[PDB]
From a paper:
M1R, a myristate-modified surface membrane protein conserved across IMV, is involved in viral particle assembly and the stimulation of immune protection. The L1R/M1R protein is essential for virus entry and membrane fusion; however, the precise mechanism underlying this process remains elusive, including the identification of their host–virus interaction partners and the critical functional domains involved. We identified a cross-reactive Nb, termed M1R-01, which targets the M1R protein and effectively neutralizes both vaccinia virus (VACV) and MPXV. Notably, M1R, which shares a high degree of homology with L1R, stands out as the most conserved protein across the entire orthopoxvirus family.
To delineate the specific epitope recognition mechanism, we determined the complex structure of M1R and M1R-01 at a resolution of 2.59 Å. The orientation of M1R, supposed with its stem region perpendicular to the viral surface, allows M1R-01 to make a diagonal approach at ~45° angle relative to the viral membrane surface. M1R-01 employs its three complementarity determining regions (CDRs), with particular emphasis on the elongated CDR3, to project into the groove that is formed by the clustered α helices (α4, α5, and α3), β strands (β3 and β4), and the loop region connecting α4 and the β3 on M1R. The specific binding orientation of M1R-01 yielded an unexpectedly high buried surface area (BSA) of 1129.5 Å², in contrast to the BSA of neutralizing antibodies 7D11, M12B9, A138, and A129 (data unpublished), which were 825, 943, 798, and 622 Å², respectively. This indicates that the interface between M1R and M1R-01 undergoes extensive interactions, particularly within the CDR3 region (W100–A110). The CDR3 region alone accounts for more than half of the total interactions. The corresponding CDR3-interacting residues on M1R are clustered within a focused epitope, encompassing α3 (A94–L95), α4 (Y111 and T115), α5 (N157, C158, K161, and Q165), α4’ (V121) the loop connecting α4’ and β3 (N130), β3 (V131–I133), β4 (F148), along with the sporadic residues I38, N96, D134. In addition, the CDR1 (I28, N31–D33, and Y37), CDR2 (A50, I51, S52, D53, S57, T58, and Y59), and FR2 (F47) regions primarily establish a limited number of contacts with α4’, and the loop between α4’ and β3. Among these interactions, a total of 11 hydrogen bonds were identified, with six involving the CDR3, three in CDR1, one in FR2, and one in CDR2. We assign M1R-01 to class II based on the partial overlap of its epitope with that of class II antibodies, which are known to bind to a linear epitope within the range of 120–130 amino acids on the L1R antigen.
Numbering used by the authors:
A (entry chain H): 1 to 123
B (entry chain G): 2 to 173
The structure:
Amino acid sequence: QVQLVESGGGLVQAGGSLRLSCAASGFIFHNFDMGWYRQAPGKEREFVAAISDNGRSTYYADSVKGRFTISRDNAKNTVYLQMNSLKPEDTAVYYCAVAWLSIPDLAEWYDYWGQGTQVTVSS
Amino acid sequence: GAAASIQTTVNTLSERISSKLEQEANASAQTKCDIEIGNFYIRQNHGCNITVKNMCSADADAQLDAVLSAATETYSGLTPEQKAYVPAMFTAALNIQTSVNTVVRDFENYVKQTCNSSAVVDNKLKIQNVIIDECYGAPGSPTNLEFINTGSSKGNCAIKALMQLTTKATTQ
């Protein structure tokens, strides 16, 4: 019944920009700190961005700081990952999920993880 | 008297955590917390007083194997007729293999692999909230859960795994 849905990805030439969105349904979202994470072929998942429930606190991985921007619309129940200055090293499957400390049940953690949207930044 | 066994176990657990944190980490009620804990909600709160004590330090690995210490301690100090109930709370909380004689090693492998995950260790939102699904209380008696804060995302990770195992027992 909790469904996160991620869209906005595709192919953009390096040094380009993409706006990633995450539609939220199934729960009181305004209550939830949320994150963008990514998993590339072969590498394990990686934290990218973090928004507070409200949106006043954010956090970014050290390899995306300055180029990435997380955000939320608590009215539309949605999280955006503004991605600028992309590099072929950002190519990955991107996932909005719930911040871990804020996951209700660690046995069904997948329910708070979206299915992903992919991004292939090319030379 | 069945509830009281668990409630006591949870208060013994909290004591051992806030102690093993200052004894086995340089943690103090007045130390600064790299990450504070803004809010503590329970989805279905049927009698669980929720409190957040900051007992922060800076060495997360110590914070981690220290909270590991509190759990293995509060486990064997229990009756083996009670330690017999933990395997279910493992599968119930963390969808993981049971066992009543290898479970200390099961929690260890999990937290050493989950709380050591980048998505966990590298998320450093200064104000993070904590949310649990269900938590219960004795009809006259509240279960008193303290979310002790460590400050480091790693530490607070281990704290939450235990809170699962602790809020997964309150089911009774």
